[PDB]
Amino acid sequence: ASVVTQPPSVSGTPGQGVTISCSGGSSNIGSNPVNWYQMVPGTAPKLLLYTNNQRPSGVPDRFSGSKSGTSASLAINGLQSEDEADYYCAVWDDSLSGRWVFGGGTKVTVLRQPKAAPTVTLFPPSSEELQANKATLVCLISDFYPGAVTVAWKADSSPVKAGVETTTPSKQSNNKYAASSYLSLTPEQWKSHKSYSCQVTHEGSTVEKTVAP
Amino acid sequence: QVQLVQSGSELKKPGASVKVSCKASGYSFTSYSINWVRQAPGQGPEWMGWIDTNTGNPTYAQDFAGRFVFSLDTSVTTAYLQISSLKAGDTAVYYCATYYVDLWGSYRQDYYGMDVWGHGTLVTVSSASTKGPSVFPLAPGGTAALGCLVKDYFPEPVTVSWNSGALTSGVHTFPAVLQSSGLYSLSSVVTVPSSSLGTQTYICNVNHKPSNTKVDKRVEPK
């Protein structure tokens, strides 16, 4: 994962306040000034704060920043719709060899409907595909909100990583999100196990679906 | 107003090289350094280094020192990034960045040139060529889901209907995944009462224009 740690997902109804933690180490946040960036689709990444708490011309004062010890924080007080975006903290790190390091990003959602855990459907490979000497497990993930998930697979009871491909979340017509994850196997690997499991984590809660040969 | 215009999206085979450009304007090009940053799918951005636009000397982050080259053509105030021996892991959006020059005196050549970013250049490392999808059925009271796996096609888009467009209720076609091959795959699914599984006809109609591919696939349980 990333060198500095951000929550994947932060949310509030409009007008509410939220904060985004950015946890690092002595060699980075603990000794050097922090920048915050806002990423909106169709828009170049935008500097939101620099030297911890300074706002560039144009950035509203409802955004504020701070740093303490080895962590920094971005506060948004009075969420507005245009604040919905991905946010990234960044700082110079003296440790590795000298480089900026970034957090993994935080999606801020301005809630417009109740939080919804995803519906997860897991499909085994078809006879047709297995006949073609291939195998694909299909894990489909829909109706979740806010739109952030992480997907883990496991063979029987062991994590796999290899052969896994996962989409980013995309907005549905009902303003909740969808994502999919594919696990590519050999026909042999499919048959040589008792089961495969697709685990979807959303707002801290994991849902698991399992299929077997 | 500081402005950075980056070159268009690129599709390259593994082992090939690519050169992307960053055209700067609105300020004194040779008085302020250019910084380079990439972000690969899922991951947080990674800082690659900077180049002194006066001396021309580049400095590279540890992880990018070797296959990556920063260069300049100052006469057209453009900074370039070249990558050789491209790998799957090089697939990313590549950004150039510099200073809000108004806030950094008259001259600055260091790693703080991170205020203003270009829109980014997507580089996709791919060995894919135009190809139609293979279509396979997806089969698992209450409700249940059946569908079609539209596998290994290129390029986008594929269109999917069910029973010739007649069936729309409970149909959900998912955005495609781009796998490391450079090929895409997607899935479309119909949510239905479980009793309808194998008692009612469900045919997905898949069209892939670039390859002149039309496929009708009936989907049954088991």
Q: For tokens 């250019």, name the residue.
A: B34
Single out the residue of B74, B26, B36 nearest to residue B53, CA to CA. B74
| Helix, strand or coil, per DSSP, at residue A174 | coil
Same domain for A141 and A67: no
**Interchain CB distance below 8 Å, B62 and A88:** no
Q: What is the resolution of this structure in A?
A: 2.1
Which of A 78-97 lie inside 8 A of B, CB atoms?
A: 88, 90, 92, 96-97
Single out the residue of A129, A120, A167 nearest to residue B149, CA to CA. A129
Q: Which whole-number Å values give the CA distances from B22 to A149, B12, B59, B81, B98, in the listed order?
A: 34, 19, 17, 8, 11
**Interchain CB distance below 8 Å, B45 and A99:** no
Q: Which residues of B touch A55 (CB under 8 A)?
A: none
| Helix, strand or coil, per DSSP, at residue B89 | helix
Spatial separation of the C-alpha atoms in residues A124 and A212, rounded to whole Å: 7
Task: Enumerate the β-bridge partners of residue B20.
Answer: B81
Give me A66's structure tokens: 């701070």
Cα-to-chain-centroid distance, residue B43: 13
CATH number at A170 reads 2.60.40.10
Are A100 and A75 spatial neighbours (Cβ–Cβ below 8 Å)?
no
Task: Enumerate the β-bridge partners of residue A171.
Answer: A177
Q: Does B136 touch chain A (CB under 8 A)?
A: yes
Spatial separation of the C-alpha atoms in residues B96 and B67, rounded to whole Å: 17
Spatial separation of the C-alpha atoms in residues A47 and A81, rounded to whole Å: 19
Same domain for A165 and A60: no
Task: Enumerate the β-bridge partners of residue A76.
Answer: A18, A63
Spatial separation of the C-alpha atoms in residues A66 and A53, rounded to whole Å: 6
| Class of B128-222 in CATH | mainly beta
Are B102 and B125 spatial neighbours (Cβ–Cβ below 8 Å)?
no
Same domain for A103 and A117: no
Same domain for A88 and A118: no
Pairing relationship of beta strands A9-12 and A106-110 according to DSSP bridges: parallel
Q: Count the domains in chain A.
A: 2
Single out the residue of A107, A101, A106 nearest to residue A35, CA to CA. A101
Q: Does A58 touch chain B (CB under 8 A)?
A: no
Pairing relationship of beta strands B58-60 and A46-49 according to DSSP bridges: unpaired
Helix (H) or strand (E) holding B137: strand B134-138
DSSP string of A123-169, one letter each residue: EPPPHHHHHTT-EEEEEEEEEEBSS--EEEEEETTEE--TTEEEPPP
Q: For tokens 């993930």, name the residue.
A: A141
Same domain for A154 and A121: yes
Task: Enumerate the β-bridge partners of residue A97.
Answer: none
Q: CATH number of the domain at B1-127, out of 3.65.10.10, 1.10.287.130, 3.40.50.740, 2.60.40.10? A: 2.60.40.10
| Helix, strand or coil, per DSSP, at residue B209 | helix
Same domain for A73 and A119: no
Give me A70's structure tokens: 């080895």
Same domain for A34 and A69: yes
Give me B55's structure tokens: 């001396």
Spatial separation of the C-alpha atoms in residues B133 and B217, rounded to whole Å: 12
Task: Enumerate the β-bridge partners of residue A77.
Answer: A17
Tell me the backbone φ, ψ of residue B75, rounded to 5 degrees. Answer: -65, -20
Spatial separation of the C-alpha atoms in residues A185 and B29, rounded to whole Å: 51
Q: Does A40 touch chain B (CB under 8 A)?
A: no
Task: Output DSSP code: residue B131.
Answer: B
The CA distance from A162 to the nearest CA of chain B, in Å, is: 12
Q: Which part of chain B has CATH 2.60.40.10?
A: 1-127, 128-222
Give me A148's structure tokens: 């952030």
Same domain for A36 and A117: no
Q: Which residues contact A157 (CB under 8 A, 6 or more apart)?
A: none
- The percent helix, strand, coil of chain B (3-state, each to 5) is 10, 50, 40
DSSP string of A79-105, one letter each residue: --GGG-EEEEEEEEESSSSSEEEEB--
Same domain for A136 and A209: yes
Same domain for A88 and A16: yes
Same domain for A91 and A46: yes
For residue A154, the enclosing domain spans 113-213
Last residue of a domain, one of A97, A112, A127: A112
Pick among A180, A181, A190, A210 to test the B interface (most B CBs inside 10 A): A180
**Interchain CB distance below 8 Å, A168 and B41:** yes
Are B4 and B23 spatial neighbours (Cβ–Cβ below 8 Å)?
yes
Backbone φ/ψ region at A120: left (φ over 0), alpha (ψ -120 to 50), beta: beta
Spatial separation of the C-alpha atoms in residues A29 and A68, rounded to whole Å: 9
Last residue of a domain, one of A47, A79, A112: A112
Tell me which amino acid residue A145 is: Y
Spatial separation of the C-alpha atoms in residues B48 and B121, rounded to whole Å: 14
Nearest CA in chain B to A40: B119
Last residue of a domain, one of A70, A90, A112: A112
Q: Provide the experimental method for this PDB entry.
A: X-ray
Spatial separation of the C-alpha atoms in residues B59 and B57, rounded to whole Å: 7
Same domain for A120 and A209: yes
Tell me which amino acid residue A77 is: N
Single out the residue of B79, B83, B188 nearest to residue B135, CA to CA. B188
Pick among B93, B138, B191, B194 to test the A interface (most A CBs inside 10 A): B138
The CA distance from B118 to the nearest CA of chain A, in Å, is: 6
Burial class (CB in 10 A: 0-12, 13-18, 19+), B55: exposed
Q: Which residues of B142-169 are buried (b: 16+ CB within 10 A; e: fewer)?
A: eebbbbbbbbbbbbeebebbbbeeebee
| Helix, strand or coil, per DSSP, at residue A189 | helix
DSSP string of B20-85, one letter each residue: EEEEEESS-GGGB-EEEEEE-TTSPPEEEEEE-TTT--EEE-GGGBTTEEEEEEGGGTEEEEEE-S
